[PDB]
Design a protein around this ligand. Structure first.
Ligand SMILES: CO[C@@H]1O[C@H](CO)[C@@H](O[C@@H]2O[C@H](CO)[C@H](O)[C@H](O[C@]3(C(=O)O)C[C@H](O)[C@@H](NC(C)=O)[C@H]([C@H](O)[C@H](O)CO)O3)[C@H]2O)[C@H](O[C@@H]2O[C@@H](C)[C@@H](O)[C@@H](O)[C@@H]2O)[C@H]1NC(C)=O
Ligand SMILES: CO[C@@H]1O[C@H](CO)[C@@H](O[C@@H]2O[C@H](CO)[C@H](O)[C@H](O[C@]3(C(=O)O)C[C@H](O)[C@@H](NC(C)=O)[C@H]([C@H](O)[C@H](O)CO)O3)[C@H]2O)[C@H](O[C@@H]2O[C@@H](C)[C@@H](O)[C@@H](O)[C@@H]2O)[C@H]1NC(C)=O
Ligand SMILES: CC(=O)N[C@@H]1[C@@H](O[C@@H]2O[C@@H](C)[C@@H](O)[C@@H](O)[C@@H]2O)[C@H](O[C@@H]2O[C@H](CO)[C@H](O)[C@H](O[C@]3(C(=O)O)C[C@H](O)[C@@H](NC(C)=O)[C@H]([C@H](O)[C@H](O)CO)O3)[C@H]2O)[C@@H](CO)O[C@H]1O
Ligand SMILES: [Ca+2]
Ligand SMILES: [Ca+2]
Ligand SMILES: [Ca+2]
Ligand SMILES: [Ca+2]
Ligand SMILES: [Ca+2]
Ligand SMILES: [Ca+2]
Ligand SMILES: [Ca+2]
Ligand SMILES: [Ca+2]
Ligand SMILES: [Ca+2]
Ligand SMILES: [Ca+2]
Ligand SMILES: [Cl-]
Ligand SMILES: [Cl-]
Ligand SMILES: [Cl-]
Lengths: 149, 149, 149
């Protein structure tokens, strides 16, 4: 009994792992994930940058980061309203870095941005026209998480 | 060896349990669940109150209940049409109680309601405007379930 | 004690099986699944018929098939644009069959369709008004899958 029951349970676990993987595939599909492309998801809730970071991390994702014009538009369509991007110059003023590390490979700043206006702006929002503007990380913007391709 | 196989399998199970919980979190988020707020969801099907109660229970949820104006609006936008609420006055006419227990606190009655019209109306529906109207439980209204915050 | 650990593992696995099924049920409900009815899902991605079939099959579903006017309207609403249906006359020109087997019964062909235009058209697409047209399986249309009732 012992060894047989153990061997079976191993098959039971393997079966459940496959089922859960398929469930995740179906869930990603319904969330709009295109084949071989990373995808963006939002609950349409507005919150400060720190809360967005924590939220996406818990979901094992990251704050949405556009690496090109296509992805920039994609985020825009998902968010619908101004949302935070996973880009800040919190570590060193003037040096915008990805929250995942590294300097920007792609940008789409509005004229005269980023300006660190007034009291300061260390976060980035993608406006309702695709251009970027740095804003206060304390302002409440739409939470948009990104998941791997 | 057996003890090692067993320990290793317990580890796989814990990981799988954590992974499914993550799947649940991401799903709720994609469906609009806000931070620290109850999750309201509908399949847009209209049915009698008894079926709504049965359906939500099968999903391990309950018929949506607005505890305040904020939740009332949240349910209003998920339903979009007239939907049953988890409130009835079947025990003592005029005394509305939540299906999960307790006396009705927050209410948002429409003018001249509740009127227990005709043969009697013991269920409650949140109509398009967000206001409430008492209606026969046998009538078919949208099914909206609620899950914990 | 080995046997005690084994029995707990079985209870852990069975609890996990039930929870995964609850997750699947809740996901179907959120996707608009009506009681005792099959449901449809789409990621809004356009691809050739062979790709759609492969995708749905991988998710344990099939390319959407309207068996009546109700299902047709439902698919039309999910798709939003022209999408492939799980119906083709690839095996024998002129005789449309469901990808899962059997000859086509209910149909909703547009005026003067099907016409196997030019070199040929063996796949079927549901257009914006809900009517059908036969087209090349090589063309890219929205991927819409159906899952069991
Ligand atoms: C004066 O106050 C208002 O009076 C009207 C009419 O009595 C109420 O609306 C009726 O509500 C009853 C609920 O028991 C029914 O829904 C009536 O509707 C039908 C019906 O019985 O199903 C619709 C049928 O199509 C109709 N038959 C035909 C052949 O047309 C049928 C007959 O006319 C009826 O049997 C004759 O007695 O009537 C409604 O007309 C108002 O109640 C409010 O609105 C309704 C629609 C419900 O939502 C109630 O919960 C509301 O209180 C009532 N309003 C107030 C403020 O008192
Ligand atoms: C009178 O009957 C009607 O005839 C027209 C013209 O042939 C059909 O429309 C064509 O259908 C074919 C189906 O294979 C293609 O969709 C044609 O479209 C293209 C194409 O071949 O992809 C579009 C290309 O952009 C175009 N090329 C350029 C450079 O512009 C190309 C060329 O014109 C063509 O290849 C030259 O050889 O045409 C359609 O024009 C009608 O078919 C029906 O409507 C179309 C749009 C499809 O939905 C078909 O499945 C429909 O049956 C046809 N209608 C009927 C009722 O018989
Ligand atoms: C190109 C440029 O430099 N433009 C300047 C404006 O900044 C641009 O637009 C604003 C809206 C932001 O998007 C910037 O990122 C962008 O560069 C600038 O506008 C002012 O910017 C500051 C940024 O620190 C701020 O957004 C001002 O709005 C608020 C504020 O957040 O501080 C909005 C608050 O709701 C409001 N408070 C209340 C209680 O209503 C405050 C409040 O009025 C001030 O704190 C009072 O001191 O303002 C926004 O106006 C503009 C300002 O002069 O200058 C442009 O050159
Ligand atoms: Ca700074
Ligand atoms: Ca700055
Ligand atoms: Ca700025
Ligand atoms: Ca009564
Ligand atoms: Ca009553
Ligand atoms: Ca009434
Ligand atoms: Ca053919
Ligand atoms: Ca012809
Ligand atoms: Ca053909
Ligand atoms: Ca045709
Ligand atoms: Cl800041
Ligand atoms: Cl009643
Ligand atoms: Cl073809």
């Amino acid at each position: 009994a012992i060894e047989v029951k153990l061997a079976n349970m191993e098959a039971e676990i393997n079966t459940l792992k496959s089922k859960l993987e398929l469930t995740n595939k179906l869930h990603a599909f319904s969330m709009g994930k295109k084949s071989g492309k990373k995808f963006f998801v939002t609950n349409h809730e507005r919150m400060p940058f720190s809360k967005v970071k924590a939220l996406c991390s818990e979901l094992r994702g990251t704050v949405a980061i556009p690496r090109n014009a296509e992805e920039n538009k994609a985020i825009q369509e998902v968010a619908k309203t101004s949302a935070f991007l996973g880009i800040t110059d919190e570590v060193t003023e003037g040096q915008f870095m990805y929250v995942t590390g590294g300097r920007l490979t792609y940008s789409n700043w509005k004229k005269d941005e980023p300006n660190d206006h007034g009291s300061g702006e260390d976060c980035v929002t993608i406006v309702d026209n695709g251009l970027w503007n740095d804003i206060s990380c304390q302002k409440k913007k739409t939470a948009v998480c990104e998941f791997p391709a």
